[PDB]
Amino acid sequence: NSINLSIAMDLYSPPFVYLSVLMASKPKEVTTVKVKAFIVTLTGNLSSSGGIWSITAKVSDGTAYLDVDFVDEILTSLIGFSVPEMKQSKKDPLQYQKFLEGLQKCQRDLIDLCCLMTISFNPSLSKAMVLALQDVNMEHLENLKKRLNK
């Protein structure tokens, strides 16, 4: 029932904030912020357990490193196949070929990822889950100039 008002801009200021600042604020509960980051490296295999895609990676926004979990939807979008669709793709060489092409595309997309990501950080567990990805746009450029030019 309390919000440290003195860090509101530190955590929410448009277009993105910094991981180091978030950590320095010592969050006591799940906190959602937007950062501009890229993937330093994948930290585990792409899993299909539970009938959904999931993988862990280490990202950075230039101020710190953070382990994050990509779960379900974002991965289905990058790959182009859901888990059950992949399982069905198996009985046909050509459909399976498309899946393998989608797997590699997903691999390259994560290698080339450099955008704004909305992350749900759980301080009590020490990592986050990526909620969304967004390409930087003019709106972000204007917000950055605004908090820095006048």
């Binding site: 600042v21 890229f38 330093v40 908090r147």
Partner: protein, 131 residues
Amino acid sequence: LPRSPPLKVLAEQLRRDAEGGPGAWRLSRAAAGRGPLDLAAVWMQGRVVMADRGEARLRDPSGDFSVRGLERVPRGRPCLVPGKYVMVMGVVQACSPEPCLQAVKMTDLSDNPIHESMWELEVEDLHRNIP
């Protein structure tokens, strides 16, 4: 693997304000009125000026810098081509007279012109928020 996160920096910062050496670089920040900023790895961006296998010379608005070890980085959209605007995560090997990086990663950012239009502001914004 850097023990320092990949700090966003412009070529001029390493060229002009970096101190120390090999295993220990520090960015002087006297003007800001802050102490030295330790760095080992950096996030840098720029236009590819020239590329010769494993090596390249990039240029940001404040100067040039070279990158080596590119044969070892993750193979994403290929961008080791003159004219491409890219980002590089690398370990600092030298700062003056010309910054040199051992590449950890190089990503193509040519598709979206916003990246290049935002880089200098990003560097300024990040440094303004570091104690």
